[PDB]
Coordinates of N, CA and C in Angstrom, one line a residue:
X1 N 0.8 -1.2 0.0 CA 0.0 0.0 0.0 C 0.9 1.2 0.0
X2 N 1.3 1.7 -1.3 CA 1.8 3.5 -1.2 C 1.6 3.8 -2.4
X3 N 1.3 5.1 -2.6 CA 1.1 5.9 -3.8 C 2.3 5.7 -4.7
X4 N 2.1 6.0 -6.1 CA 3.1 5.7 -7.1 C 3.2 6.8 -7.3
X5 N 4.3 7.3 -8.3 CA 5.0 8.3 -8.9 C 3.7 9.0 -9.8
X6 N 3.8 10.5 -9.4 CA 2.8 11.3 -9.7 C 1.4 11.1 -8.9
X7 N 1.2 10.6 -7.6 CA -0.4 10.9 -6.9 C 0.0 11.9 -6.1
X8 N -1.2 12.8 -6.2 CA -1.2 14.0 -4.7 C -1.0 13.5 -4.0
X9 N 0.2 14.1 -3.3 CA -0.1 14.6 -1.4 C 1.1 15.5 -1.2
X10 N 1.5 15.5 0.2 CA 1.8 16.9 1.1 C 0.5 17.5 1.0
X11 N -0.8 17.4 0.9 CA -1.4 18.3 0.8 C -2.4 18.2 2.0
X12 N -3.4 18.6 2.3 CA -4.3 18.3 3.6 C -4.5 16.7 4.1
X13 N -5.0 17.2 5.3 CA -4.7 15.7 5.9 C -5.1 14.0 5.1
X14 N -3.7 14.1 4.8 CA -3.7 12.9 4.1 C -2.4 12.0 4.1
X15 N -2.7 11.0 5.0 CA -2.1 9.9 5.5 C -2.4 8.7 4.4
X16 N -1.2 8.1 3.8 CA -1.4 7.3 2.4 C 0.6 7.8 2.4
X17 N 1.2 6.7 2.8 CA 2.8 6.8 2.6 C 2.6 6.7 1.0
X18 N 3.5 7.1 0.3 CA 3.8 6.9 -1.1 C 5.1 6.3 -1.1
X19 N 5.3 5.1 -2.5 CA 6.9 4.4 -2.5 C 7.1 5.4 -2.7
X20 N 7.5 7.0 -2.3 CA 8.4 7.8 -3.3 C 8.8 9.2 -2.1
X21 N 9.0 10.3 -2.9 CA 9.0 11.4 -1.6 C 8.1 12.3 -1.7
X22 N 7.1 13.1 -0.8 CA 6.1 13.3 -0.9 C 6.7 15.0 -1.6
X23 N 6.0 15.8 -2.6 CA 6.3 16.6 -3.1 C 5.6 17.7 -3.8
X24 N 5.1 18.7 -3.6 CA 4.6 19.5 -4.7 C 2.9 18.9 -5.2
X25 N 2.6 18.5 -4.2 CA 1.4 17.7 -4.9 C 1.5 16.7 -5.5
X26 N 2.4 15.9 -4.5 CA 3.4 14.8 -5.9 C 3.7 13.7 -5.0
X27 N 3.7 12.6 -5.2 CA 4.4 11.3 -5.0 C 5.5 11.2 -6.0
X28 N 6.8 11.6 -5.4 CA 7.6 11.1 -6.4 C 8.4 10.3 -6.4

């Protein structure tokens, strides 16, 4: 379970790890 390259987050409460680094509205 983690977001892939390019899903929103850093953005409002939103817990969801992404494989990636959380960025700009970005899972990257």
């Amino acid at each position: 379970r983690c977001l892939h390259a390019g899903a929103a987050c850093s953005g409002p409460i939103q817990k969801i790890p992404c494989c990636g680094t959380c960025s700009r509205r970005k899972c990257t």
